[PDB]
Every structure is written in structure tokens, then in C-alpha cells.
Short mmCIF file of C-alpha atoms in Angstrom, two decimals:
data_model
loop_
_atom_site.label_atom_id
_atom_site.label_comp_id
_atom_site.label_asym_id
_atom_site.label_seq_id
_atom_site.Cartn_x
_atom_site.Cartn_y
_atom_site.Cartn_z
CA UNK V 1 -4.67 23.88 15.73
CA UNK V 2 -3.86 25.02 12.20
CA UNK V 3 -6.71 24.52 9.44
CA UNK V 4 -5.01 21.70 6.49
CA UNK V 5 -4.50 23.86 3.49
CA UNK V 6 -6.02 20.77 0.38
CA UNK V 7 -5.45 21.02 -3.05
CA UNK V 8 -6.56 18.73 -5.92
CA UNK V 9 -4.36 18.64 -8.95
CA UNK V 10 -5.97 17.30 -12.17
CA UNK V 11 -3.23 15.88 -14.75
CA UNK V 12 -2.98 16.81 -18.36
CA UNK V 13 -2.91 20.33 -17.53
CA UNK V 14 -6.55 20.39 -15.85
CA UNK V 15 -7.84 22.40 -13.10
CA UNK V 16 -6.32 23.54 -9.66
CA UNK V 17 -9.11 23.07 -7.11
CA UNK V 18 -9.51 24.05 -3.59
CA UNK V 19 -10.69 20.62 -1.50
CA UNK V 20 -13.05 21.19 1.64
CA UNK V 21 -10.63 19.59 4.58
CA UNK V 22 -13.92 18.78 6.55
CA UNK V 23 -15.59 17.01 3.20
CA UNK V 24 -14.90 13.25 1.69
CA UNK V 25 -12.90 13.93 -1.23
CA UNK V 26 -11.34 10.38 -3.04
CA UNK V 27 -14.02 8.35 -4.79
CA UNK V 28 -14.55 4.55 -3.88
CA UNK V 29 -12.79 3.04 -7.38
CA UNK V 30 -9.90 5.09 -6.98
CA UNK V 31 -6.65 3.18 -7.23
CA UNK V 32 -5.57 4.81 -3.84
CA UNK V 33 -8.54 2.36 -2.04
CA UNK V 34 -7.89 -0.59 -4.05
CA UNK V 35 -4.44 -1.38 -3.74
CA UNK V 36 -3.74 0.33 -7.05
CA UNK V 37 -0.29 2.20 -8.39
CA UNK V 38 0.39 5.51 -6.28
CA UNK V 39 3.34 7.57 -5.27
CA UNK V 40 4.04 10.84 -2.90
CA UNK V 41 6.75 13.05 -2.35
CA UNK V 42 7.53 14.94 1.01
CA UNK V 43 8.50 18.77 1.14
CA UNK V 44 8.77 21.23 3.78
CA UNK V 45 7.51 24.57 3.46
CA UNK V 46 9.23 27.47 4.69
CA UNK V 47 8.65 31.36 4.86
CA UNK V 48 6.46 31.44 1.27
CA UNK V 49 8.35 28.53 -0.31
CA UNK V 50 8.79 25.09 -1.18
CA UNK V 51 12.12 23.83 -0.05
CA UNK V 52 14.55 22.22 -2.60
CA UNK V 53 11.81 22.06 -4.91
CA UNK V 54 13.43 21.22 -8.10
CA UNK V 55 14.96 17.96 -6.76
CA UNK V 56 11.74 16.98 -4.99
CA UNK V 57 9.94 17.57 -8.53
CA UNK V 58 12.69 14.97 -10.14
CA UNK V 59 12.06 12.27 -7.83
CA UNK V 60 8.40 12.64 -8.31
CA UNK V 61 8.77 12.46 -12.10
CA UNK V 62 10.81 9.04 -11.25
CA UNK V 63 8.41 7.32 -8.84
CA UNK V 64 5.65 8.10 -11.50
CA UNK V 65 8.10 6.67 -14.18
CA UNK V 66 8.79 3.46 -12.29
CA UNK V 67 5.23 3.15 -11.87
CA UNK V 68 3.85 3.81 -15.49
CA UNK V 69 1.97 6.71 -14.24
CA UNK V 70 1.09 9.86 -16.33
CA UNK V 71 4.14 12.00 -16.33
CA UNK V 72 3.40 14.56 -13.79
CA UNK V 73 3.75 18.24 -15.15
CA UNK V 74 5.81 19.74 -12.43
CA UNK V 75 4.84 23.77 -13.61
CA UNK V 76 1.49 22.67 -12.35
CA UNK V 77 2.28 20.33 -9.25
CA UNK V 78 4.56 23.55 -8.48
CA UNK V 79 2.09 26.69 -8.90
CA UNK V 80 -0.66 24.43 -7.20
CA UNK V 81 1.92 24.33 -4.20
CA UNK V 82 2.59 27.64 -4.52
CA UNK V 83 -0.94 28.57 -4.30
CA UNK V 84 -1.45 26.63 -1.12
CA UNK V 85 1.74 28.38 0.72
CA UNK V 86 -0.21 31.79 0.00
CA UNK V 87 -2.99 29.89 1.24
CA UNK V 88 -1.41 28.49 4.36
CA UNK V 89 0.46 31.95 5.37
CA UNK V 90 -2.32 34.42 4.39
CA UNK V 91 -3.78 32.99 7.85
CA UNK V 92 -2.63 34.09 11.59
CA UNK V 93 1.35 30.13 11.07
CA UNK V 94 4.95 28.45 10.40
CA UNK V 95 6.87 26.04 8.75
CA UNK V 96 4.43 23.75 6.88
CA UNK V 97 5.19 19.91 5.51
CA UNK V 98 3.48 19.33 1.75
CA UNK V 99 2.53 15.93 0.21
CA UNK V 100 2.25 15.38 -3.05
CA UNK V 101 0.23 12.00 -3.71
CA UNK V 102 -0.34 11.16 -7.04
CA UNK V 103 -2.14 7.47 -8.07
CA UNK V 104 -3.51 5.93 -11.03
CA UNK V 105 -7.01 7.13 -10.19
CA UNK V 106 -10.99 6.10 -10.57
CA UNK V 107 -11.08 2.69 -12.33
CA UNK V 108 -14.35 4.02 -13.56
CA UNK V 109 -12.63 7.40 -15.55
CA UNK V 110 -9.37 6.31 -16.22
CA UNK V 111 -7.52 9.44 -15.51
CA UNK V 112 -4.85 9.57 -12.46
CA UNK V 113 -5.87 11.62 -9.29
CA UNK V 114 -3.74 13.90 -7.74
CA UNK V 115 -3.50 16.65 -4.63
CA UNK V 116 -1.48 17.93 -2.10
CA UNK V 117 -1.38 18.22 1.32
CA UNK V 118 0.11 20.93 4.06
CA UNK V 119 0.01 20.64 7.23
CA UNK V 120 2.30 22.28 10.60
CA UNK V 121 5.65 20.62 10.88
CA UNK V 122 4.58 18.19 14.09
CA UNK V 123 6.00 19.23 17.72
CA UNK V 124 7.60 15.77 17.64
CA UNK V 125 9.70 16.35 15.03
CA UNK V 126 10.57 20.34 15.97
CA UNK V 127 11.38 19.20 19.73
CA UNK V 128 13.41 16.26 17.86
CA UNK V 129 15.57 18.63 15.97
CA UNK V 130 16.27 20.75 19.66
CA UNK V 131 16.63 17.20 21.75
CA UNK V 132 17.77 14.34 19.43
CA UNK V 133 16.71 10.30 18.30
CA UNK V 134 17.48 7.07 20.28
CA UNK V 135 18.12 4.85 17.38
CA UNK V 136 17.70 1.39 16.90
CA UNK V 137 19.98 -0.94 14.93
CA UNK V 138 18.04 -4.03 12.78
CA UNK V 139 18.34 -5.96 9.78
CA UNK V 140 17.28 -5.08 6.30
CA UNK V 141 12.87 6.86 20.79
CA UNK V 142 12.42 6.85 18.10
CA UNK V 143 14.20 5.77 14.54
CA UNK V 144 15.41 2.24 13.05
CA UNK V 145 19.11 2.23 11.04
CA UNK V 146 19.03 -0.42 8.84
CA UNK V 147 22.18 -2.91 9.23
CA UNK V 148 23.73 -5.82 7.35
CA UNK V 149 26.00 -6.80 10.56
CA UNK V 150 28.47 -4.14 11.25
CA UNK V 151 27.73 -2.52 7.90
CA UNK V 152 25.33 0.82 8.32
CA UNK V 153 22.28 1.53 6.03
CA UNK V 154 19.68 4.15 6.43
CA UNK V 155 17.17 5.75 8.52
CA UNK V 156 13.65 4.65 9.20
CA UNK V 157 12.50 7.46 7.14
CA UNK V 158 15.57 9.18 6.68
CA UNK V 159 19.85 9.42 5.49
CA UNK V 160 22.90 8.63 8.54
CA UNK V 161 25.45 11.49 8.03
CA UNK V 162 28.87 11.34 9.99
CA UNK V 163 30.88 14.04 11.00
CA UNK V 164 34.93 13.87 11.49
CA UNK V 165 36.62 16.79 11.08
CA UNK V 166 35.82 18.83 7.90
CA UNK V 167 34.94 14.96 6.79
CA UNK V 168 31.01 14.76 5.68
CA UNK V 169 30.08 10.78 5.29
CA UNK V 170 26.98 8.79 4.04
CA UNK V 171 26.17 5.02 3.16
CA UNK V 172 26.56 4.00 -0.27
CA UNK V 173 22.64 2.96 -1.17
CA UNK V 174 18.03 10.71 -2.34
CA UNK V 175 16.54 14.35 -2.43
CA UNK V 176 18.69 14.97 0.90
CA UNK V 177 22.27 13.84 0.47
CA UNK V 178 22.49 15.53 -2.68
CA UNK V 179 20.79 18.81 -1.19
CA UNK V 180 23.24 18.33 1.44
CA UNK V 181 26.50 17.60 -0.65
CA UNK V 182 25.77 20.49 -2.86
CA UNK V 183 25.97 22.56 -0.16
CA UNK V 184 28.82 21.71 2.24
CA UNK V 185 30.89 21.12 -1.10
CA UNK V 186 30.56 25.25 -1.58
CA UNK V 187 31.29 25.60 2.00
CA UNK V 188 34.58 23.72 2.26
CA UNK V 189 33.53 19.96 3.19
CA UNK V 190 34.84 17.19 2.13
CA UNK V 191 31.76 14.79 1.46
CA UNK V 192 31.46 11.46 0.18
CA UNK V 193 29.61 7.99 0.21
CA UNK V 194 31.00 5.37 2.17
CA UNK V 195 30.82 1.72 3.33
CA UNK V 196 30.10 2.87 6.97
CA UNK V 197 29.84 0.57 10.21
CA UNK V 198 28.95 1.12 13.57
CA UNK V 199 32.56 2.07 14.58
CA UNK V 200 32.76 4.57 12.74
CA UNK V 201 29.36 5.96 14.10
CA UNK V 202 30.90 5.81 17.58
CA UNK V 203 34.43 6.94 16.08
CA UNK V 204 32.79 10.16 14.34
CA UNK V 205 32.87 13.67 16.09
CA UNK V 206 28.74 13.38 15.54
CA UNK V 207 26.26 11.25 14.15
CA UNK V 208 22.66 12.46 12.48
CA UNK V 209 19.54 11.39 10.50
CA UNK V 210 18.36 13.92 8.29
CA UNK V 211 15.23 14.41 5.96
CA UNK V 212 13.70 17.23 4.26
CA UNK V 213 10.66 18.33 6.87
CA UNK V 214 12.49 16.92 10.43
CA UNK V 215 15.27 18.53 8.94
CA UNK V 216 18.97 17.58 10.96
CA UNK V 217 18.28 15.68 14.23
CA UNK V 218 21.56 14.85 16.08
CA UNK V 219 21.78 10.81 16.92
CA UNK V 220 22.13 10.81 20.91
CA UNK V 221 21.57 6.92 21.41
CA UNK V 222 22.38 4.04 19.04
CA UNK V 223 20.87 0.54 21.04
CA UNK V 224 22.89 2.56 23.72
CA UNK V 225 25.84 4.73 24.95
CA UNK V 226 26.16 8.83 24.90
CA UNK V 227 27.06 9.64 21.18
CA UNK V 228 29.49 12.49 22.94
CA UNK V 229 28.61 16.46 21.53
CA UNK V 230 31.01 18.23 19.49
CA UNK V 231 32.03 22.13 19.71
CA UNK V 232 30.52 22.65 15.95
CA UNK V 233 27.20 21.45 16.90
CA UNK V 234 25.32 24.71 16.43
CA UNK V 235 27.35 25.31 13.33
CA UNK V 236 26.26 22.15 11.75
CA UNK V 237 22.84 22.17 12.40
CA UNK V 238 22.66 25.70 10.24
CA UNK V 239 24.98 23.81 7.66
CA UNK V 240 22.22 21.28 6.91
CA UNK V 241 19.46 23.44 7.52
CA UNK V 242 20.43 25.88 5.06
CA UNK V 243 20.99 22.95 2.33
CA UNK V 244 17.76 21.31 3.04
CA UNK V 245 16.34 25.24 2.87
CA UNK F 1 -23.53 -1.73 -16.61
CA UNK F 2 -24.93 -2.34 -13.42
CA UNK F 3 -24.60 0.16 -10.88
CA UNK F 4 -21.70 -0.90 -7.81
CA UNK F 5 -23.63 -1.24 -4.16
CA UNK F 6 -21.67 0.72 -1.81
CA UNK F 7 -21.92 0.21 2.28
CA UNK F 8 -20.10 2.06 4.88
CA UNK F 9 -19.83 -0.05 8.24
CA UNK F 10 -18.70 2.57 11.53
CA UNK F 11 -16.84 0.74 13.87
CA UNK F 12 -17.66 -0.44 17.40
CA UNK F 13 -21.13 -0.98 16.32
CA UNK F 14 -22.21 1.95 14.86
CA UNK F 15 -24.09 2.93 11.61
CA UNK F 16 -24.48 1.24 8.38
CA UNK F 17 -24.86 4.05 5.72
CA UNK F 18 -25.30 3.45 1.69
CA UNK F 19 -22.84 5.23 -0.02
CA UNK F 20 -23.51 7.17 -3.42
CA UNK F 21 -20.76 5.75 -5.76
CA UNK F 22 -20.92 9.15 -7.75
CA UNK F 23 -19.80 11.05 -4.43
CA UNK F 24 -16.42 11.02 -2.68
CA UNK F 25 -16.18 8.64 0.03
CA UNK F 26 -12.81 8.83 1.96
CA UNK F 27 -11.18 11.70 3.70
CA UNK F 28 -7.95 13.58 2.90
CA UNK F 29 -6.07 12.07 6.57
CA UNK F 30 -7.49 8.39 6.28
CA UNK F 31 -4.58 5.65 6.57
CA UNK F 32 -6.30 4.60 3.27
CA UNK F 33 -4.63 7.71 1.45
CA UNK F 34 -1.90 8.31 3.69
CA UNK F 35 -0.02 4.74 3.94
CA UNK F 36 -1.18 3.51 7.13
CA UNK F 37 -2.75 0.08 7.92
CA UNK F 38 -5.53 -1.30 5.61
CA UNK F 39 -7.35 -4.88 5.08
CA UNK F 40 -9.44 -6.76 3.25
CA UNK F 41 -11.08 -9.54 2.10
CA UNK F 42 -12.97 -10.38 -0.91
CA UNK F 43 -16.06 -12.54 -1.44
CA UNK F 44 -18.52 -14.55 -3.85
CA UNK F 45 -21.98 -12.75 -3.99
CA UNK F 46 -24.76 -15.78 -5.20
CA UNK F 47 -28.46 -16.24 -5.19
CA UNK F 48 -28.88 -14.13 -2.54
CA UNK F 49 -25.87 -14.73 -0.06
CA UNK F 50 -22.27 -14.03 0.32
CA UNK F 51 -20.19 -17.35 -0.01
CA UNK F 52 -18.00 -19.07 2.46
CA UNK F 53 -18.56 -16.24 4.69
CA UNK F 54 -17.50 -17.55 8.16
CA UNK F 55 -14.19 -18.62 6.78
CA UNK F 56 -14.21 -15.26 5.29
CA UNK F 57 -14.76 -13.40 8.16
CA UNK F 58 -12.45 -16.07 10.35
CA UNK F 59 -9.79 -14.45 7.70
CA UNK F 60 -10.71 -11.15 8.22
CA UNK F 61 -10.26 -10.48 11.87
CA UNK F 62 -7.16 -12.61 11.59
CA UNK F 63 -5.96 -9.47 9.17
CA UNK F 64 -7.02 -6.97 11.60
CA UNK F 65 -5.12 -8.73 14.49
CA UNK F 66 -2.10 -8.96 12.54
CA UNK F 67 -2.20 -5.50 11.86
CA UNK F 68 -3.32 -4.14 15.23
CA UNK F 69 -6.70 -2.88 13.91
CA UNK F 70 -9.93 -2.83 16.00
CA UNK F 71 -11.57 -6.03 15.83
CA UNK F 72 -14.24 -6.30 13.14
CA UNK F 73 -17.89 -6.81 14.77
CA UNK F 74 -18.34 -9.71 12.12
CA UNK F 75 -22.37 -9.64 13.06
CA UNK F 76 -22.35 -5.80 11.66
CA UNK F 77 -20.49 -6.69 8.29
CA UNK F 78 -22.52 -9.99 7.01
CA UNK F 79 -25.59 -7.63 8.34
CA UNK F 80 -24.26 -4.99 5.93
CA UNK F 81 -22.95 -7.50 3.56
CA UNK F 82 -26.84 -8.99 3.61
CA UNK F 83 -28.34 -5.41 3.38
CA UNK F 84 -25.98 -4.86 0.17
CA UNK F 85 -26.58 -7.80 -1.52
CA UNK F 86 -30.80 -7.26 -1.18
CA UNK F 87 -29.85 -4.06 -2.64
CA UNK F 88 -28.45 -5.39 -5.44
CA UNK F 89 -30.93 -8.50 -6.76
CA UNK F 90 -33.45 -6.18 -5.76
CA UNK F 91 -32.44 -4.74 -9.41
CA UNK F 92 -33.59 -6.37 -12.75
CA UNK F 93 -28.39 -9.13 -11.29
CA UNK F 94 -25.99 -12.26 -12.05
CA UNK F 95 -23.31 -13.25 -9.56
CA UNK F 96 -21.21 -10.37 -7.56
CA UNK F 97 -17.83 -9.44 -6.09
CA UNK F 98 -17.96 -8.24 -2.39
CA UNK F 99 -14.35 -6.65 -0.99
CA UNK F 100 -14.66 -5.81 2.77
CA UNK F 101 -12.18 -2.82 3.23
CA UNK F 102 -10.95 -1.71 7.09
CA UNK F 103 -8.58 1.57 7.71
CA UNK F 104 -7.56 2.43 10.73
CA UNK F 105 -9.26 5.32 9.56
CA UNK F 106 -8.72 9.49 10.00
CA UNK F 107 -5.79 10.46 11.97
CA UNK F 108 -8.18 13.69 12.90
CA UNK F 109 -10.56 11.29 14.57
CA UNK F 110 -9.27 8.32 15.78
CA UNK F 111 -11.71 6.23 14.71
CA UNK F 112 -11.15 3.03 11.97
CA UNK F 113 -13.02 3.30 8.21
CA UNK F 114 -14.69 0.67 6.95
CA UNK F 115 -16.76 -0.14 3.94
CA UNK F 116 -17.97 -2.60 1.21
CA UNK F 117 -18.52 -2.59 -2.72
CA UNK F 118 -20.63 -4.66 -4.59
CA UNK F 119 -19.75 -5.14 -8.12
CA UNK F 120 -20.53 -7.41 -11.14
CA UNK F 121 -18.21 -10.31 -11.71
CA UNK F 122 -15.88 -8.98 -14.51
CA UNK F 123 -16.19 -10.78 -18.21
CA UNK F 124 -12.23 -11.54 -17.72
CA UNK F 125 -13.74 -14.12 -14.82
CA UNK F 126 -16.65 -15.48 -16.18
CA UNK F 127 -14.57 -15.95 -19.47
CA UNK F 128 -12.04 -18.15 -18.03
CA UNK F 129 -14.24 -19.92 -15.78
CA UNK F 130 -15.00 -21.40 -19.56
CA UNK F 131 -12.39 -21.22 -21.01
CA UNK F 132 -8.76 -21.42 -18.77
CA UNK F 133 -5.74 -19.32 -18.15
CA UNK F 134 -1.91 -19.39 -19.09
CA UNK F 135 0.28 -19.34 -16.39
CA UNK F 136 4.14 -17.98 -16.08
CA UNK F 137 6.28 -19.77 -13.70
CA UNK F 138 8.28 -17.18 -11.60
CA UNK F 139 10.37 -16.56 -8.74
CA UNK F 140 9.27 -15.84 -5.09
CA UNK F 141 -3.17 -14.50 -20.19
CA UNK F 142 -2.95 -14.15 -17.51
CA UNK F 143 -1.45 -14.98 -13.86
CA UNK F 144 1.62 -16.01 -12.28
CA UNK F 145 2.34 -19.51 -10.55
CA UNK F 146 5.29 -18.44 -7.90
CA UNK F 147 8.42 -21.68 -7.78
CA UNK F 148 11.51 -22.11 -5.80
CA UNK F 149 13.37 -24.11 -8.97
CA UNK F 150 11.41 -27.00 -9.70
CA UNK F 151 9.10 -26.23 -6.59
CA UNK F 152 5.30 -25.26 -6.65
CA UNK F 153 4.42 -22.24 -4.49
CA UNK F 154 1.06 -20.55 -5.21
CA UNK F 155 -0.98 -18.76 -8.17
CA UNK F 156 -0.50 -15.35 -8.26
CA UNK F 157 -3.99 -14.20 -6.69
CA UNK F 158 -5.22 -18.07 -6.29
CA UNK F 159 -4.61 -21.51 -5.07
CA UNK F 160 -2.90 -24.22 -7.37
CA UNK F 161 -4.86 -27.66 -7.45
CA UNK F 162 -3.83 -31.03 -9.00
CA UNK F 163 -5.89 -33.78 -9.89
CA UNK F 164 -4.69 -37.26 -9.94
CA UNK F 165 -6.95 -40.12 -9.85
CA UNK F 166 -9.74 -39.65 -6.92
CA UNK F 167 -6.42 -37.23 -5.48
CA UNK F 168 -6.55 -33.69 -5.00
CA UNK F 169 -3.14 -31.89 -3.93
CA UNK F 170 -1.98 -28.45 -3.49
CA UNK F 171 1.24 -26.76 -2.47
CA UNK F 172 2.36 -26.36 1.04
CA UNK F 173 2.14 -23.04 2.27
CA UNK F 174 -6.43 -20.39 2.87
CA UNK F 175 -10.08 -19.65 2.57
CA UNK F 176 -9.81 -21.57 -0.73
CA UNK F 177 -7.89 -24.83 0.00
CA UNK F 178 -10.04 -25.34 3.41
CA UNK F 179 -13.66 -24.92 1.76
CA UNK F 180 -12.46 -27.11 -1.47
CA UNK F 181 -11.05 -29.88 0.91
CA UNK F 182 -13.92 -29.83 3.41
CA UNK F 183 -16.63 -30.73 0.52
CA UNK F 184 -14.25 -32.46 -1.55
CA UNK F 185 -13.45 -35.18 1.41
CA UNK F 186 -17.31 -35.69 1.91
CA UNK F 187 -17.39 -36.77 -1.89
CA UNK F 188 -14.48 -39.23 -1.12
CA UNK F 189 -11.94 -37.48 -3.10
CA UNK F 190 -8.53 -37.69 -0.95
CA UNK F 191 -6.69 -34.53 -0.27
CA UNK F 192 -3.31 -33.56 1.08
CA UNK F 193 -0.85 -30.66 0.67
CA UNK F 194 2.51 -31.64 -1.08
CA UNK F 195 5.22 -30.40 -1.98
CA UNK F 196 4.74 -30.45 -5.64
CA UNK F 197 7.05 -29.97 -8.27
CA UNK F 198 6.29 -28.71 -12.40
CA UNK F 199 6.43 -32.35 -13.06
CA UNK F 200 3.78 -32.64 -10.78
CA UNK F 201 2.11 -30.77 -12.53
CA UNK F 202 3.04 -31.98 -16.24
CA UNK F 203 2.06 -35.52 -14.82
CA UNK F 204 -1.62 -34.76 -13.09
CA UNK F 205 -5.02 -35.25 -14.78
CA UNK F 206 -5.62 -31.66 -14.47
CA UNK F 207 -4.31 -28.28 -12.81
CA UNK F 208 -6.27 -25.76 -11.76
CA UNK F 209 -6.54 -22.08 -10.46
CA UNK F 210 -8.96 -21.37 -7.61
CA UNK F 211 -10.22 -18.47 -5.99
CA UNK F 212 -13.09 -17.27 -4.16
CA UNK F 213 -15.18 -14.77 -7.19
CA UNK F 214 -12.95 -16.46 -9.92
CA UNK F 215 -13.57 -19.60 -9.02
CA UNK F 216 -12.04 -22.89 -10.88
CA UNK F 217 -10.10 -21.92 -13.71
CA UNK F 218 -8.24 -24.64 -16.11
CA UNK F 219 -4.63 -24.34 -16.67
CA UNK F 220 -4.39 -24.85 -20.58
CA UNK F 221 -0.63 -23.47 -20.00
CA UNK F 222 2.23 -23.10 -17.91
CA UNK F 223 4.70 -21.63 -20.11
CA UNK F 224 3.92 -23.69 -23.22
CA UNK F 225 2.32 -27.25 -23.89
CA UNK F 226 -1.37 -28.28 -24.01
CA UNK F 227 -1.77 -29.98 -20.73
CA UNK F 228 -4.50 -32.51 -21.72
CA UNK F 229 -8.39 -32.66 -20.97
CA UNK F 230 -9.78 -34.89 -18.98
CA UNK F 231 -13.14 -37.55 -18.90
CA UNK F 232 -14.06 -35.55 -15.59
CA UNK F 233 -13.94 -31.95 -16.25
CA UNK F 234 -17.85 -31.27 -15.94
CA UNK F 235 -17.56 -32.99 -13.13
CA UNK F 236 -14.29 -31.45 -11.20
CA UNK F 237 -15.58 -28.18 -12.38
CA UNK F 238 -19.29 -28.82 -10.31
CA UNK F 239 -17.37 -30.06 -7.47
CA UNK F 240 -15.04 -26.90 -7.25
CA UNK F 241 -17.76 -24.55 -7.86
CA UNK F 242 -20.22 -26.35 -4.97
CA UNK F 243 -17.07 -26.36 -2.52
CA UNK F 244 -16.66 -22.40 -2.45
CA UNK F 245 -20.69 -21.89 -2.50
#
């Protein structure tokens, strides 16, 4: 069992502290505790790096935004993370997932706390990318795809993609399709939003939910039925895997 | 400034520990921090005892049911509730807020988190207790009454309460409306929910915000208007404040 790697990053340029996994580290006033403003962003770590870092520091600049939270300064959210890959890889290790949380802090100080988090990418979700989700279908084994009767959504915790041909589709509502877009795009794919339903999840040449540390999982079951297997399935699982990379 | 009482109650009957409120409290992998389940519930500290507490507790292991956390041991939390407030008139002391606060605690152990604080009642409270609050109507200085059109839902963190006569009515939907009706009908005042409507409101003898540390507050406003005074405000005002005691 791999040893957290914890960081503490202080805003308005402050210090980069190492935090004791095994020792209590958020204070009892702190907005985090008392159903105060807070936000997080996901990222997976990969050999010495933060994965599509620059889009992941964007959304974290909006989520603070929507909030009124102090503008996070991304050089430091980013060298803190940096410092904890070195960390987490100077041991003994492989892919990693890192949490940013950032809330509005001690009600007692007035000044926002923040850290990070990485951990090892969980055996669920690395057997999931290998074997595949049994979705379920619900209103606005193991995922949920929001629906609005025939009309498709999004993951529990994560974007539908469809697959038809050289044809890349999404749901018109993130970090991930636009990752992925940018990608494909360069490689030939023709990619695009769309009001998706269930037929054409069971008309596509392969279905998927895909998020930044899980990565591309292929949709096998949706309430039911074999979801077929296409011949590119190998090739599109290093498509999105080098996007999300 | 007085200094905040801090408990830590271990599930499944174990320890009560005071807690520094200088030192960190909560681990890095508690649901607290990491958006899992949490409740609470928040109580009147007075002369020595925590108010309405077996409603308050009733309400709390409802919350934990609901959210499929271990059942609170309610004999260990009015013990350390008890415990806490000793600690603090023991000092060095005018009335107190208590918040109960359950996790279901480190994903590393397994085990829920639970704890209390102890805190003065803030000056925004005691100041409106004298002297009232204006109130925004909205849909589903300083609070929020929720409507459906012309319809009365509830205050934003508080019950709404209209007096009429010897009758006291509130909207159909509490710890707050059961303890005010249960003394209230002893005095022969004559309570009922109703579906009540601004005009309701603009028609009563008074209107009212009630919670359990707040206590009766007078609605001066509800988006403009001086909404009267009435003969029996000293009165209304002792009988609100003996209910939730």
C-alpha cells in the first residue's frame, strides 16, 4: 500500500508545506467542516507529470470564481504538484490521481485553505479500463447516465462518447471533451456535440465514459444488452488515452 | 472573546476527548474533506443545559438514517454535550451555540467522526432577537422567506410563524414548530399548519422567524412595508423563548 503524498498550499503566494498523512491537519472553523464555500479539481498523474494540466488549472480558476473564492495562483497550485510527483516517484510506484481542494478557510483567520492530495489510481478503476461499466439509465456495475427520456446526458462522474465510423459524438451540456476533441481533431476525427439518445448508443460502433484519472472505459451494459466490440477497440483506447495524457 | 469548547465523540461507544481549538482536528481522507456523507444538528446552550435536546437528538439519528450513517449513541453525545457545556460556565459565559457534527469518517479506517463545538451566540443573534430582520421573498438584513407565487414556504434557516388573535400558524411543510406548538397549546393558544399566503402574512398581528440559538425574531420587513407592532409582543416574545427552552 502506497504512502499518500499531502501537500498544503497557502494562497497569496505563501508557503508550500509538507502535511504528515498520519497527523490531523484541517482546523475545526474551517469552512470545509461547516458547510462553508469549497471546490476541487481531479488530475491524474503520470510518469513525472500532471496530465492536461493547463485546462485542469482553468476550471479551478472558474469553480473558485463562481464561488467568490481567492483567485487561486495556478504557478503555485502547479509547482506544489510538481513537488509532490517528485515526491510520490522518488519512492519504490505508478500512475497517481491528485486533488486539489481549495475552501474559504478558518472562520477564525479569514484566509482560504488549500492542499493537494495523491494517491494510486484505485484497482477498480485500472481493472475498469481492461473490463468495462454496466451503466444505468435515470433521470436528471457501476455508473449512472443521466436521461431526459430518450435524450442522453452524462456520466455519474464522467462524459458519454460515441463512436461511428471516423464520427466522434458527445451530449450537448468539461476538462475531458475538450482534451479529447483537441486531439482526435489532429488525428483525422470528425467530432462534435450532439443531441444524443439511446438509439444512437445502441446504433454506434462503441459507446464509453471517460474522465481524466479512470481514463476511457468502454460501456459493455446500458440497463442491459451486449454493447457489441468493434475492430478499432485497441486503437481507440490509445486515442483517448493519449488526449487525456 | 470567549474561547470555543471543542468535544470529539468516537463512535460505538468509545472515547470522549477535548479537543484543542488551536490544533488541527480532522484528517486528510475524512468524508468531511473529501465529499462524503456528513450531519448535523445545532442546539441552544442555557443555564447549564442544552435545549430541546430529545427532539434534537430524535432529529439527529433521523439524519444519520437517511444518510446510512452509524446510529448516534444519543446517551454518549448529551453526556459529551453535558461535559462541554460544564466546561464552558465553568469560565467567568452567556448563552451558547452547540452543532453536533457526524462523518462517516476516514476512508483509511472505517470508522465514523464525530464531534461538537461550543461557541458564543453571535451579536448578529442577540441583536435581532431585539430588534427584527428583513426578509426577501424568493423562489424554491438578512434571510430569505422561500414562496411558490403567492405561497408561504419556509425562512431561509428558520420557521415562519403568524399570529392572529389567540392563533398561531405556520406553513405546511421541525424541531422548531413541534416544541413552539407543544407549550404554546398548554397556554391555550390554537395552532395549525396552513397553507399561508403573503397576504397572510400582510394581514396577521405579527410574523415571526424562529429557530433553535436564534430564537424569535420579528419580521419588520418582507420586501418593504412596516408590518405593525402589536399590544402582545413582550408577551409572544416570552412565550417563544420558554417553548424552545
Amino acid at each position: 500500500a502506497p504512502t499518500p503524498v499531502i501537500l498544503i498550499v497557502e494562497p497569496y503566494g505563501g508557503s508550500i508545506r509538507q502535511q504528515n498523512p498520519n497527523l490531523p491537519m484541517v482546523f475545526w472553523d474551517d469552512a470545509a467542516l461547516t458547510r462553508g464555500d469549497g471546490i476541487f479539481e481531479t488530475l491524474l498523474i503520470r510518469d513525472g507529470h500532471a496530465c492536461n494540466v493547463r485546462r485542469h488549472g482553468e476550471r479551478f480558476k472558474a469553480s473558485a470564481a463562481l464561488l467568490g473564492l481567492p483567485e487561486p495562483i495556478l504557478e503555485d497550485w502547479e509547482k506544489a504538484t510538481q513537488m509532490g510527483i517528485e515526491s510520490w516517484y522518488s519512492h519504490p510506484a505508478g500512475e497517481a490521481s491528485c486533488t486539489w481542494t481549495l475552501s474559504r478557510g478558518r472562520s477564525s483567520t479569514g484566509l482560504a485553505s488549500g492542499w493537494l492530495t495523491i494517491t494510486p489510481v484505485s484497482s477498480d478503476k485500472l481493472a475498469q479500463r481492461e473490463h468495462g461499466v454496466s451503466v444505468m439509465t435515470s433521470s436528471r456495475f457501476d455508473d449512472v447516465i443521466f436521461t431526459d427520456g430518450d435524450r442522453v446526458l452524462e456520466g455519474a462522474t464522467s462524459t458519454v462518447v460515441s463512436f461511428k465510423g471516423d464520427k466522434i459524438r458527445t451530449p450537448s451540456p468539461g476538462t475531458t471533451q475538450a482534451a479529447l476533441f483537441a486531439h482526435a481533431t489532429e488525428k483525422g476525427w470528425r467530432c462534435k456535440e450532439k443531441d444524443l439518445s439511446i438509439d444512437d448508443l445502441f446504433g454506434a460502433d462503441s459507446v464509453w465514459l471517460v474522465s481524466s484519472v479512470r481514463g476511457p472505459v468502454r460501456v459493455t451494459r446500458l440497463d442491459g444488452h451486449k454493447l457489441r466490440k468493434p475492430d478499432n477497440e485497441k486503437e481507440i483506447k490509445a486515442l483517448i488515452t493519449k488526449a487525456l495524457g
